[PDB]
């Protein structure tokens, strides 16, 4: 009975997105950002669609490596950036020093870093489904902690894991393949059906 | 013959703690124009508070009025002789969604209504088999004429501007087409009544 | 005592035709079927009362009135209409929407076949006092269109009736304009 | 289903003080032809105590006994299938009188009783809209088939005599047409049925 | 500072005895623009109800309600340096009405109001020096520049229409002419203010 609570549906940590940094100096940006969105795989998408209201608290991890992937001692800093707040404009730039915007150090060979992401909204809580005229939750970046440009190529896997689900008022499942991304678009020329098809109704098997 | 559906199970109450409460022809039935429903059609819905923003006086209260709380009795019936066979689903949808078949006509029909494209998905993108699991009655012109649903207000915010935000939505659907022999009536009306319930203001 | 309002005054409806609404279904929902004024003492469809003789006796009357109506259909035909009542001061609703903005009553003949309204107040002044007028209309909206199983005929008619409540008052003894010599 | 007309509200009574008070035969049910009533119809009347000057024991005691005294009890009754609609009006007018359209069979119908030139006038010269101040039901085959009025004696002197004095009459009038689909019966009957109560001879 | 003058000695009421007795937004302070007052002025007058028709949720319950009751709370004030002299008769004239010199502007003005031509003769054809029988008050710079007038509702009727009928209304004259050394401000102004009593539709 345990593994039907809605708590216990949504644990079980995943991978959320993956980002790839590189340190190029000045022809590479050297560093990367990443918004917070719950929805850019559709498995989990699927599953938050299938309720109107949502409230949770985020936990997130940071696998990273290095193209073949061995490890070496280089710093790294994930900073955090608040709703309402700008982003690096660049690997240097002043915000990576801004103390609202939380960070942590951690050395490349350390074992994955972990965070926990409170419950932001001003509302009481999230809506996917809003019919008027979402949700930001905010935004991560990531650069290499050297006064010199260290030529090197990464990509960060974010592992996003949810705590404290309640939900409200459930959805139907969809049907439709997802056109696009924040909207519930559906081609309306060719669309899937619920069931396949067999040869008689008469006829089970 | 009182059969009701309280949606999710609660009444419509007013907000826990100066808003307005008017009741003198605010709260009283409105009762919209009627749908003519024939073999080939699709269905109708109607959005809330959109629906009423210019009617009566409520209308004039839900202009102005930036923040809007209330709830509703919805009672649907349906004219039909002994001959006409048919049902309708009559659902109710929070923060129901048209998307695009790739405008606001679509998410604010007005007091008309509108009609879907492919009921089948909802126009939704979702499959309607499973859209009972929103409070719904049946009208099966075998047995019921008409069904009534109470509505609470269902918001995350306890207010809101009913001018920029429709809360949700009403369905009437026919599952099974409307057949009647030859001679009959050929055109079945739909009646639609919205008595608000606690409106705060 | 109610007696029937002859409603259907026209130089067209001849015999008993005069006291019939007609309704049918060829007609579409919102539409008006019948108006008529409230004028119990006034030339009009009132004229075939005894409200309507006998405040020909009076000059100045006042009160609430009732009207009631019946309809005659087939047993299984239904639909609904609308029974509104625009006070004094206003002209008769322009449709069904300002229609129902205002005193009215949804009536479903397919359930109830008999509905009364009842005016709430009348008089008789500003007429004669200013002389020192236009009060009430009626409507009937066709809500829906009238619905009909097949091999029934599929036109009705509506029968209008006319009294006065208890405060119904007058004064004033006069003499009609009706008789001749 | 028992719905019932006291006409002006008393109930037929013997006289205040000998007179024959016979109840064997006398008082009982007594049932005439029916007439079969028509899309084209006008409506018929009938005159008591004529009606019933040759009829089974009461006719008898109609005969002599220069002296009449008694009340009655009417019951009308239509057949008519779901799918006629059409209205009677059932009235009884004391001292009914017909005049001339400018006869003793006008004046004495019998039994079979007599139908109506112009009936929106009554034949009296009387507007057919004010009837309704005339103990009355009403027939509409929508609801009731049946319609049922006692009568009291009513007369300015406590007796009078049964052939020559007829001291009123009873109406059906169709004030809506019959109307029917083609292949139902094109006509439809009506029963008419006299119990007399507390006669006196 | 207190001083208040009821009309006829009457406080406003509630009709002895269904109409509506509206207080949320509708009996509040409503203030007209302001009169600016000259050396050469002859004074002013308004009309009630009709000042309001137009006005706020009042002019709204003015408008439909062809019946109509109402009482009123007047105070009327005046801005003037120590060093300005003159005095103004406030008068309040039950179904007060201009006749010609020899329209309805000068039956009704409106909101603005309107002037006199011959104060003297109120326009009336009346003394304006026997003026005092009616509920009034002085403002005389010299001691009060302010005046307040309550005025129960006065009709032969219990209820009329505030559209066709001016109850009645209120008056502004200068008796002696405003006067100030050169230098000080050359136009007074004069404030109104209506709060409605008792009001009823």
Not at chain 1, 7 to 33: A, C, I, K, W
Not at chain 3, 26 to 47: S, T
Not at chain 3, 97 to 117: C, K, N, P, R, Y
Request: glycine share 6%; with cysteine.
């Amino acid at each position: 009975v345990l593994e039907t609570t809605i708590n216990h549906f949504f644990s079980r940590s995943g991978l959320v997105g993956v980002v790839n940094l590189t340190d190029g100096g000045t022809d590479t940006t050297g560093y990367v950002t990443w918004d917070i969105d719950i929805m850019g795989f559709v498995q989990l998408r699927r599953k938050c669609e299938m309720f109107t209201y949502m409230r949770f608290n985020a936990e997130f991890t940071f696998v990273t490596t290095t193209k073949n992937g061995e490890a070496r001692p280089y710093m790294l800093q994930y900073m955090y950036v608040p709703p309402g707040a700008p982003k690096p404009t660049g690997r240097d730039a002043f915000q990576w020093q801004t103390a609202t915007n939380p960070s942590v150090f951690v050395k490349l060979t350390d074992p994955p870093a972990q965070v926990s992401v409170p419950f932001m909204s001003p509302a009481s809580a999230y809506q996917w489904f809003y019919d008027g005229y979402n949700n930001m939750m905010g935004t991560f970046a990531v650069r290499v902690v050297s006064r010199e440009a260290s030529q090197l190529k990464l990509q960060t896997r974010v592992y996003m894991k949810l705590k404290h689900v309640r939900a409200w008022v459930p959805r139907p499942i969809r049907s439709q393949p997802y056109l696009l991304k924040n909207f519930p678009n559906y081609d309306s020329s060719k669309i899937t059906n619920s069931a396949r098809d067999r040869s008689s109704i008469k006829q089970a098997n | 013959a009182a059969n009701i559906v309280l949606a999710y199970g609660e009444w419509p109450e007013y907000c826990p703690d100066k808003p307005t409460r008017p009741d003198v022809s605010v709260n009283r039935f409105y009762t919209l124009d009627s749908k003519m429903w024939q073999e080939n059609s699709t269905g109708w819905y109607w959005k809330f508070p959109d629906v009423l923003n210019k009617t009566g006086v409520f209308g004039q209260n839900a202009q102005f009025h930036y923040l809007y709380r209330s709830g509703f009795c919805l009672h649907v019936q349906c004219n039909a002789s002994k001959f006409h066979q048919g049902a309708l689903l009559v659902a109710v949808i929070p923060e129901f969604v048209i998307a695009g078949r790739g405008g606001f006509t679509t998410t604010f029909p007005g007091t008309t209504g509108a009609t879907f494209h492919d009921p089948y998905v909802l126009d939704s993108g979702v499959p309607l088999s499973q859209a009972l699991i929103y409070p719904h009655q049946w009208i099966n012109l075998r047995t019921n004429n008409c069904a009534t649903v109470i509505v609470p207000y269902i918001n995350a915010v306890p207010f809101d501007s009913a001018i920029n935000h429709s809360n949700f939505g009403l369905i009437v659907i026919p599952v099974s087409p409307l057949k009647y022999s030859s001679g009959a009536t050929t055109a079945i009306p739909i009646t639609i009544t919205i008595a608000p319930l606690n409106s705060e203001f | 005592v109610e007696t029937i309002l002859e409603v259907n005054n026209t130089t067209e409806a001849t015999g008993l035709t005069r006291l019939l609404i007609p309704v049918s279904s060829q007609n579409k929902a919102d539409e008006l079927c019948a108006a008529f004024m409230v004028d119990p003492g006034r030339i009009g469809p009132w004229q075939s009362t005894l409200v309507g003789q006998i405040c020909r006796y009076y000059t100045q009357w006042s009160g609430s009135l009732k009207v009631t109506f019946m309809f005659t259909g087939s047993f299984m035909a239904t639909g609904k209409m609308l029974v509104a009542y625009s006070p004094p001061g206003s002209a008769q609703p322009a449709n069904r929407e300002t229609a129902m903005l205002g005193t009215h009553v949804i009536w479903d003949f397919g359930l109830q076949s008999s509905v009364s309204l009842v005016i709430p107040w009348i008089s008789n002044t500003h007429f004669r006092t200013a002389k020192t007028y236009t009060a009430g209309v009626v409507t009937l909206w066709y809500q829906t269109n009238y619905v009909v199983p097949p091999e029934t005929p599929g036109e009705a008619y509506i029968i209008a009736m006319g009294a006065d409540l208890y405060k119904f008052t007058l004064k004033i003894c006069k003499d009609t304009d009706e008789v001749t010599q």
